[PDB]
Each structure stands twice: as C-alpha cells, then as structure tokens.
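idk why but the lab printer keeps eating my pages so im just putting this in chat instead. protein + zinc ion:
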Amino acid sequence: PNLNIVLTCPECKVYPPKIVERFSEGDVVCALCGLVLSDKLVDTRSEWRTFNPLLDGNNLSTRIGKGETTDMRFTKELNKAQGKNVMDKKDNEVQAAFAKITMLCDAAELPKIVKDCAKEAYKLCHDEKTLKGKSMESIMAASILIGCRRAEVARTFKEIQSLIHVKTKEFGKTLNIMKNILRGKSQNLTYIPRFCSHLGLPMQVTTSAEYTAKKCKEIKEIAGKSPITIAVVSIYLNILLFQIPITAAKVGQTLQVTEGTIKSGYKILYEHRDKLVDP
Amino acid sequence: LPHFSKDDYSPESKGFVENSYLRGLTPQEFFFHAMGGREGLIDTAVKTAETGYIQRRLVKALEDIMVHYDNTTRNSLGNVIQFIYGEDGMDAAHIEKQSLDTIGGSDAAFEK
Amino acid sequence: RNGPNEHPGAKYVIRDSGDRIDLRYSKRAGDIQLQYGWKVERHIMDNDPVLFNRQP
Amino acid sequence: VHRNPARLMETLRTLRRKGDINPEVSMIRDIREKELKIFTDAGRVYRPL
Amino acid sequence: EGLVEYIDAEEEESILIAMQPEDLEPAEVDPAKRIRVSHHATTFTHCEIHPSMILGVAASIIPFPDHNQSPRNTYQSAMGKQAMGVFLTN
Amino acid sequence: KKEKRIQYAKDILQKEFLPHITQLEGFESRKAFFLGYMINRLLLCALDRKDQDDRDHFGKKRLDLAGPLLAQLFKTLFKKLTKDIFRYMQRTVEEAHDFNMKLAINAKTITSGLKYALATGNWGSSRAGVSQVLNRYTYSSTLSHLRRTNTPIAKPRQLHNTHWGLVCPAETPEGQACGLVKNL
Amino acid sequence: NQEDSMIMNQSSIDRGLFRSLFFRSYMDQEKKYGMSITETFEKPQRTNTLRMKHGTYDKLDDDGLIAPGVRVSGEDVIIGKTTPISPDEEELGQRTAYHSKRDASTPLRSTENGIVDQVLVTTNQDGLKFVKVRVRTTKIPQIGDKF
Amino acid sequence: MIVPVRCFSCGKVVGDKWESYLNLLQEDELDEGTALSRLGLKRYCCRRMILTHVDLIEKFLRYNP
Amino acid sequence: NEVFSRPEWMILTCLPVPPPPVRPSISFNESQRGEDDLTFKLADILKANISLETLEHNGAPHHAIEEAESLLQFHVATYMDNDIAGQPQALQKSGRPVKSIRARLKGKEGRI
Amino acid sequence: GQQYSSAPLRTVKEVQFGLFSPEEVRAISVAKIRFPETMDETQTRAKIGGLNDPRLGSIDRNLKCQTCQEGMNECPGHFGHIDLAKPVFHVGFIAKIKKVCECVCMHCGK
Amino acid sequence: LLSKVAALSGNEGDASPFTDITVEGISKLLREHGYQSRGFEVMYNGHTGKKLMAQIFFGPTYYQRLRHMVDDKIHARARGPMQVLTRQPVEGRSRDGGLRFGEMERDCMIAHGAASFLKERLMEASDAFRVHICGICGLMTVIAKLNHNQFECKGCDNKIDIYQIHIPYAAKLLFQELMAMNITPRLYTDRSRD
Amino acid sequence: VGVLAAQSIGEPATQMKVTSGVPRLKEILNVAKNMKTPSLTVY
Amino acid sequence: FIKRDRMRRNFLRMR
Amino acid sequence: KPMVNESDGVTHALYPQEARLRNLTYSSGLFVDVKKRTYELKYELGKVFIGRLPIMLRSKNCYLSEATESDLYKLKECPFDMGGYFIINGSEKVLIAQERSAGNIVQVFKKAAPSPISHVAEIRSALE
Ligand SMILES: [Zn+2]
Ligand SMILES: [Zn+2]
Ligand SMILES: [Zn+2]
Ligand SMILES: [Zn+2]
Ligand SMILES: [Zn+2]
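predcted complex ->
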C-alpha cells in the first residue's frame, strides 16, 4: 500500500527529481534551485563493514558448538535436540548434495565458477517431477557437466564417466531431460589446449591445431564423428608436421583413442593437407 | 658475564662504568647500560598503565560532588562531605604562603 | 556575495522557516537577499574562540 | 656413566673441531654438578667465536 | 681446521671469552681513550670476533652508539624501520 | 577387572611413564635410576645446596622457525588425510561399490591447510600473529623485520645477562610489546 | 627552533632536497556471484546508470580505465565498474527509469592527486579479469613533515 | 640519483664534473680529495654531493622495458 | 513492588521483539544481504518454539519434549546473554560468536 | 531537521526501572512474528509477519515503516512479541528466582 | 664533527661502536684543515648581516625522512555522514569522520562548569532525536501520526496526554535494548516522589 | 570541587623503608587488608 | 680514523 | 618445482614477479607413491597428488636460488632481494620465529604460597 517515499522540490516542482546526492556533507539537494532535499544521509558501505541469498534463500540458522567454560553433556543434548528437529525441513539433501558435489569438484580440480554453476543447476532442478529418481549420482554428474558447459569449459563424457559410473545411457537421458528443465526455466576448440597440456606440446602446435581444427571444421567431409577424434587427429597431424616424436601408440593410450581411428582420420586429413598450412 | 672470573666482587665487574660518554664505553658497560635503559622504559610503561587506571578510579570516584549556595560541600544526594569547602571556604586560586609573626621570634623579641 | 570558494564568505543559509539553502547551485538562481531572523553559516574568521585540546 | 671424562671429553672436542660432529651440537661439562650435557636439538641460538 | 667454533648460551656457561684479541691475550696511555680492564685471567678458552656484532640490524646503522645513551639507541632503532628510501630496484 | 588393571598399570609404567628414553618393556631399572636422580635433585634443592632453577636462561629456550611449525602442521594434516582415506575405504567396502583413487585421496585438505595456515595469522586459538605482512618501508626495515623473533605472553621483558651476543640489547619496540619482541 | 623544531632552507628544498615519490596502487576486480550477475569494467553513461558518483568520467576510456600519464586528482574515478540489477528487486527512486545497471566504481582518494604511473590488467587464479593501478605523486617537504 | 644538478646549498653547477671525476679516478688513480681539488670545488657543501652520491640509475637500466 | 515487579514476571513467558532500528540489516549489492546476530537468535527462538509446539501437539515422547524445552531455553538464554558460564557458546555460520544485547551493554566502547 | 510536533515539550526527570510484565509486552507489541525467515519468498520487500516485517521499523530511507509512516530518520521503532507455549527463565534472574525458591514454601506458597 | 672532517678530507669516517677513535684525534684532523677544532664557526645574521656574538656549531649531518606527514593527518569535519547503528559521526579519515569527544573531555567540561556547551556538544553537535512518551506509562509506545495531528499509546488507553522529549539517539537505543531485555526504562516529566 | 580534587591528586600520580609511589597509592586507595611494609614508629 | 675503502689497490699491489 | 594451474586448465611454471602481479600463491605440487595391498588372513594377492606447499623464496625448491645476477635482471628480481619469505594471494607473508621452553630437563622450583608443597620437580617429557 504505497509506502514509496519520493523526494520532490516544492519550490521547483517543474520536473521529476533530477537531484544530486552530496555524500561528504550527508545531504541530497535539488540541482536547480540549490535547495537541500534531505539531511543526515545514511550509508550502505559502513553497515556492510561488519559482515547467501542466491542459494540459501531467506532461511536463517545458527550453529551450537562447545563453549569456553561448559560441559560436554550440554553440547550433546543441544545437538540431539537439533537432530530431532532436522525433519522439520527437507533441506538436508541440499547440504549433503552440495557436500558430495563439493568433494567431486575438488577432486576434479575445477575452478570455483564451475562449482557455483553446478550448484546453481542442481538448485534449479532439485526435486522436480520429471527427474523421478536417478539415484542422486546422475543428477550430480549431469549437473557438473551442465556447470561445465555454462562456464565455457570443456570436459569429455569419458572424463566425468571416469569419475562417476553413471552407465552412460541413463546419464544421457538424465542430461537430456535436465537440459529440457533448463530450457523450461527461461565447440571443440577448447579441447585442444587441454590435450596439448596432456601431451606437453609447445604453443605453436596448440595454435596450429587450433587453425587446423577450425579449417577442418570448414572443409566438411566426415564432419566430425564426435569432435574428440577430430581433435586427436588434428593434434596428430600438427605433431607429424614437426619433429617431436610421440608415434600413434603413445598418443592413443594417453588420450584414450583408437589407433585405427587416428590413422583413418590421418588418411583423409593427409588428403586435405593442402589448405591446412597456416604459414 | 662469561668474560670475567668466578666469585668476582670487584666494582668494575659488578656494573661500575668508570668511562664517560666523551671517550666511549666498553662492551661490558654498554650491556649493563642497555639493561638499565630497557628497565627504565618498562618501568615508565607500567607507571603509565597503572596511572591511567588510577586516574579513571579517581575521576569516577569524585564526580557528583559540588558546593551549593550555602557554603557546604555536599553531593547530589544531599550527603554532606564537608560542612565548609576546604574547612575555610577559600578557593585554591587566591591562597599564598604567609608567615605567622605571632609564634616567630623569641620571648624577648615578642615582648620587645 | 563572495561565495564558498573565497575565505571571507559563507556556506549555507537558513531561512526563518527552518530551511537550509546551499550557496552552491544557488548562484545558478541569481540573487539571494537576506532578511531579519535568518541564520547564515560563515567560515571561521578571526577573533573566534574555539576549544583546543590534546589527548589524553 | 664413565670413569674417565678427561680423555673422553678431549676426544669428543678434538673430533668436534675437525668437522666430524656437526658444530651445531653444544656440549657442556659441569664440574661441580659432575655432569656432561649434550644438546643436539633444534631451536638453540649460537654464535661463532 | 679447528679455528672457529659455534657457542650457544649453554656452553657459554663453561667458557672464558676475551673481547679484543691484541689487547687481552698478550701480557704487559693517552687520556682521550677509554679505560679498559686488565689481563689477569690466563685461562681464556675463546675470544670474541668483534664486540660491535652484539648489536642487531637496526642498531648497526647508529654512528658511535657507545657515546650515546641506550634509550636513544632504542628510539633510533625504532625509527629506522619507517624511514624513506629505496628497498629494491624492481 | 583387577587382573587387567595390574598388567594395564604395568603397561602404563612401561609406556606412558617417562615417554623419553624409550617405551619398551624391561627398561624399569634405567627409569628407576633416573627417578632416583630426580629425587636427588629435589631433596638436594631442599637442603639449600642449590638455587632455584632459572627459567630466564636463554640456553634453556628453543626457537621455532618454519621447520617445526610446518612439521606440526603437515603432521596433523597428514593424519587427517590418512583418516579420511581410510574413511573412504570403510565406506567403499561397507556400501559394496567400486573404488576410485580420485575420491579417496583429496588434495584440498593439504592445500587448504597449508594455504590457510600460511595465509592467516593462526597456525591451526592456540597461536596467533605468526604470519605478518612484510614491511617494505626500507631495506633495514626488511632486514630487521625478517630477523625479528617473538615471545608469547621472573620478568621476561627485562634484558637478561644470557642475551649477550644473541639478542640485540637496543633494537626493541616500545609500548605493550616492549621486550617481548627480540631481534637477532 | 624551540621544542625540537627545525628551520629548513627554502632554496635547498626548491633544488630537490628530501623530495620523495609516493606510489599508491588501486586494485579492482570484477566478480560473478551465481553466473547470472556479472560485473563488467566499462565506462558508465550518465543516462542509464543509477547510483553514479559525482566525480568526473572524462578521464576513463572505452574499457572503463584511465591510461597512464593522465593527471588525476581527488574525487576522480580511476576504474569504472557496473553491476547488473533487477527491475523488481529494489525500484528505489528512479530505478524503474534507468532500467540498465548500477554504478560501483572505485575512485581515487578524496585528498589525493598525482599522475597515473602504470596500469595493468590480468586474469587472477579463477580467471577473473582484475586490474591494478599505480599512481605516483611527488611530496615536496612541507613545514608539517617530520624528520 | 643520476648526478644531482647544481648543488644543494651554494648553487654551483656540478653535473658536468661527474664524467671528469670518474675519468680522473679510473685514469689517474688519484684520491677523492685530490679529484675534488682538481674539479674546482672549494666548499664542503658541494663535496658532500659528489662524495656521498649513490648512483642507482645504473642498477635501474639493467631492466628490460 | 506490585506496580513494578512481580516474581511471576521474573519468569519469561512472552518475549519482546525489537525493531530493525535496533538491529539494522544490510542489503549489499542486492545479492549479499547480511542480517544481525539478534535476528538469527530470534530465528532460533522461533524454530525451537514451533518445534516444541509441534512435538507437544501430537504425541509426547517425554524425552524430545525436554530436549526441545532445553533447546528453547538455550536459544532464549543465549539471546539474552550469550556469554553465560557453564553453558555452550552459540557461534554464527561465519565463524564468530553471536553478538548479544548484554555484549553490547558490557564491554568498553559500547553503548555506555 | 525533523518534523514539527504539537506535543508539549518538557525535560526528562524521574526514571523508574522495572520488570516487563508479559501482559504489558503483549499490549505494547503489534506483531506476533511466526516465520523464521527474514525477507519475503520473492527475495524482495519483507516477510510480512516475520523477523523484520513492515509492522516494525525500517531503514533504507525509501521505506516508510507502515505503522509510524514518516521516515527512518523519524521512526522510533515498533515492537513485536513472541508467545511461547512453555515458560522460560531469564539469565540475570536465575539466581534471584533461586533465592526466592529458598525464601518461600514450595507448596502452600507461604 | 667526523662528518665535517670526512667532507673536507674526502674519506668516509669509520663510525664503528667499539674502536680506538677519540674526539681529540678528530679535533686535530679538523684543525689540520683550517677550521676550528671544536666544530664552531663564525656565523653572520641573515637579516642585518651582523656577526653573531656566539659561534655556531655548524656541519653536515645525516638525516632521514619518516612516513609521518601532515598531508595524511590534517582533516576537518562539518556535518558529514553518520553510522547506521548509532547514527553518530563515523570513524576514520577516509570515511570523512569526526573527532571523538571521550569521557575525559566531558569530565574536563564538568571541571570548567560549562553545562550548555556540554549539552550542545552532546546533542546538536552530534545527534538529537525527538520522541513522544505517555503520561501513564513512560515508554515509547506512543504511535505518532502527526500528518493529521494524531497520537496514541498502545496498551494504556491514551489519546490526549502525550509528552514530547528530546533525547540522543544512543539513549533511545539504550531504552529500546532495555525493552528488548525485559526492562522498563519509564520516563516521567513530573516528580512523583517530591 | 570533587573533579578538581580528583585531578589535583591524579596529576601528581603521572610524575611518579616503607613502599612509596604507585603501588603504595594503590594500597591506600583500594584500602588493602595487607601492606607491603607494615612498619611502626614507636616514640 | 676513516674507513679504508682502497683495499683493492693495496691487495692488488701486495699479492 | 613451483607451478600454476589456471582456470582453463593449463599449468605452467611460476615466477615470483608474476606471482605478485597475478595475486597467486607461490607453491609447488606434492605427489606421494601410494601403495595398496589386499590380504585374504596373511594371504597377499600410483603417484597421487596430495596438495600444494608454499615455497619460500631463495630456497632450494624456488627457481631464484640458482639464478645469477643477469638472470635475476631478466626475471625482474633485484639482486639485493634477500628472500626468506612466502607469497600467498600476492601478499608477502613472513613467519615470525616463535619462542618456547625446552623439555626433557629436570627442573625444580619453590612455592612461597601457603600450599603444603614446598618444592616442585617438573619435567616436560616428550619424544624427539
Ligand atoms: Zn483503503
Ligand atoms: Zn529544487
Ligand atoms: Zn655546495
Ligand atoms: Zn515506526
Ligand atoms: Zn502509555
């Protein structure tokens, strides 16, 4: 019911408040007649000095731990009382889910941005009807992959699959319906420096595999057959152009790619060697 | 110090600085002088730290005491501390040291 | 008429109605005439007694 | 214990000055107390002489 | 080669240290120099490298601290940690 | 039970009693001689033949640099790491699932422990004020700052005779921390 | 000269005696809370930006920074940063008219002045684009300075 | 640094005496007082400038821009 | 005194709630909003009170009633005075002890 | 700079200190405060009936504080309450009550 | 002195603590250069150009400049920003804060006997608040809707007798915290005890 | 006069057989049950 | 009475 | 050796200058040979990263300990830099030397209090 204070100049009254705010003097003044509009200005920086709504919401809580001078009997009685009131809210799954997701993300050495994006995705899904289960592993893996796709990061399905055994198929279905959830609440180039880091290659081979990846994306023929094989055959050609020796077996056992696949792509790639030269 | 002998009660080894600041001091004397300096600093620091607490206790101890319009020193509750301020009714800004000529002098000078 | 920039000047005016007009942005208006009963805030000139103190 | 601290102390000192034992180890021989403390623990402050 | 040895504060209880080498070791005056001790002690086991090393880093900047009182050496040692200068070149 | 408290008490006398020397069985004669030595020092101090043991002697004091501190810290963090790894093992064999080396051994315990302890003043309140920002006011401020030694809270503020050649007799701050801070 | 007072030669001061340089570094960083709100270094426009400081924004470039060499004074914004806002979150004063963003720049100190020495931009650990500024100012020895 | 211009008292120009000064020191191997006596400085107000100068620009130039 | 104090009034039954003019909250950057400690304490009193009423409405385990009663007594006790001896200390989620009213009226440089 | 009031202006003389009776607390308060949440579910305004609802005081200047109106620089504040279903003790009186328990009978109350 | 001899001879003097360098030797070395061996030197006045009666100790000395400067210390506040908690002037020079009028200063003002300057310094110069209290109960429950000149006090049936008092905002914080602590700070403008 | 007396006594405290000085002043003001040097003067 | 800083020429002319 | 793993995933060598400019932590990775066995009961049938450790400057693990003068001028580090400190979040942190009492030494003290104990023989026993 109203409750909206609007400052106006009773002497000017010619336009909505086009005023200036003097913070050093603690006043707000009309920039026309020079008449002050308010005195004793409050600050927002000063009250913030002593001190998450995006995830926790408006819920408040306080810990009970042991005191300087106290008994261990009272600490247990207070914690057991909270253990009986923990059923009053169904938010125990968010803290445990964020704890295990925190352990997995900390185990994958991913930045905090992907962690916050994955936690935000799991908070958007949470406990809806279209999820209908998945045993808490597939929503966590798919949430990590979603938070990876949102932060412009690249992680292959075999990497998260190497972390969590989600049986692939149910992972693909849960990731699909999860993507539908995200669409209802309204790029292979990044993989090259990662595999070049796995092989320890110079920067010229990395950007050479970048230009080779883009050009091979423009030439068509085969189109891709999943971008991983295009990446490994691109790095394979860019490394067979120089003299640093890795052969096909070592790069096939390190990047987990079939030798017959990198040779099958190396055949047609060697056929398109003409227009792939940068200098 | 480990530079002298044991059971030495000579004044030089026990802390006497026979040199002056014009010709410099020896190490075994500059060390003791440093001990005296640090002791002086610590003592001054403690005297100040206690002086502040004493000052607060005196200020908050004597605060609500004044003199009303009857020449009687009493606090806010009416409790009379002194019937006359300073037992004479004189401010501390107009008193000067005077000599009493009644007791001074001998009996022959008194009668003279 | 001197302005807040000069030392022999003022900063704020207080009309008898209990309202303060700042000298800044008041020059855009033009003229400000004083009347009997107002309170003009001036700068610290000479012969102004102020308390001087040193802690503690 | 040992019934000959003179020759033993001379041996440990001669071997301590040659560089065999780490010079950071400080050995004391209290005569009146009739003790011989050996300190090789970390944290002691020493100075060359 | 056995020419210099480290001594802590525990071994210092059982050694006799000499200040200046060429002043207390050999066996035997202008009034401007300071008066020193004698060399009656014979069993000098060790000798001080130099007495000026007993001071710290801040007190080392003091010129002629012997002719100055100790609390001034302390105050200067405290003001030496905040004077303007050039800490590094980079 | 008494039969277990007599052997338990004997194990206390063989292990917890005097942790130094050793903790094996059979060293009771040695510890008897050392105990009689401590009683000889106590009664020998009671006969006014020896003064009270001085605690201000600088030789009886031990300093701790990054070595000991990181030894305690890395020790506790390593213990926590082993305990957590074993917790993951018991969870794995108890819940009957597959094992993974990425979920058992975590790196944020050691990284967060070392980074947090060397980041904040606390060394985990036990200890505080251990890590301070480097003073780059001048060169002698950095030299005198790195060699600065601290003493946690006889009179420890007064300069003792055992500080000859080890602690600077002049370089000391003024105020509440006077004499507690020392310089090499 | 009484009570530890000193008289210094003015001609010696004018020739550069005890004159020193002071370098103040202002470090700013853009952050993202839940990826939905992203702080961006840019030059705030006086038309659509709310909560804008009264300082001048003519010394900023297109990226919201001051190039080194530009003489700056107090109450001057060195690094311009804006934060996205929601229309139905506050709606305070004229927030329903500016629509766009809210100012959150880091200006220079009120009493300070000098010449910007060096400005550099770099991504930190988690990839957040932060910028460090360094302004130099010669402090001529004054009467109130201590020696 | 890099040779103070003029002097901090008298006001005589000294910046053109550094190159010669070093030249007299590294070539003739003379002392500091003799070189300062050859440059023409007769007052210690100037002498403290050249005698107590700490040229740090040489250690500054060794950094790549 | 009947008009001012009663032993029945010494036992707390209803609790006054102070306005934000006493505990001013902050909304910084519209996404980082901080609430005062007394606000969290009031939230604890509400959760313990509603929990105790729910446990006392349907059934009576006799033990959870005493645990919730001691929990509410602990939230009110720490709300009035957190620094109570012999009792556990309530700590905020940031890592600092809960600021109570008694702490605002006890230490130096506070309200007095 | 505050707004004028027609109430008679007087000084503050005698000050009486007493305990708060629960009936007087319920007579002074205006809200019950039942929801432990701070702000509303829409992450804006106030919870309306919670820890900080417009029935109490407000800050941020722009808000009007429903039950005083005016502004934050004028609002003295407003009081809520909490009606407990189980009586609790006050810390600063735990001893005193105990002494009362040692001064009166525990049955006939004499 | 040794700095003067070092500035004349051209060799930096050794200023080690424990050496054999005496003052007489430095006086002789300075005497060899023509100046007075005791460091004195005949000075002339700058205003009149007349010789001074007493010779002045004159010579170079190494000095250092500290971090303390006046440009980072001088500050004045005249009506600025207030804190959010106590609505009092903030703390700090960067936040445009005012000086603290502590307890000892107030005690000095009492020692001088100036009560009007104390009242003005603790009200108009800092914070001054206006509140309404009720006649029956001395609590701040008087709802004041003075846009139509209307008042109430909840819980004691009053719409006529309402008193107006000017107290500092910190005192109102104290009274509201006492009311939040189940303590009644009842205020009465009349003397009932007499 | 009370504040003037408290200052007239507290100011000399800053310049500071039986014990004298600040500890003795503490024992006098606190009215301690035991002194550092309980001595008499028997005439 | 001054710091001997010309030890490089003395050591170079002596060794 | 000291290293830095960025946000995109690339890990490269770290220098103290870039560590101060990027507000990073001058640390080095730590690995451990973790051995696993399965007994079935005495019938018996990996280089894992454990965490980073901050490296003090001018130390045998830092790159600057083996650098020369001109090399330090190339890395933009003054040769007068004494080192001996850590770098966390672009801040130069120093670990002040702590002081404590020693152990395994028999000590005796007096009790001037009206306690029935006259002398106390304390000895803080602990392993090495
Ligand atoms: Zn209506
Ligand atoms: Zn207007
Ligand atoms: Zn000159
Ligand atoms: Zn209100
Ligand atoms: Zn009323």
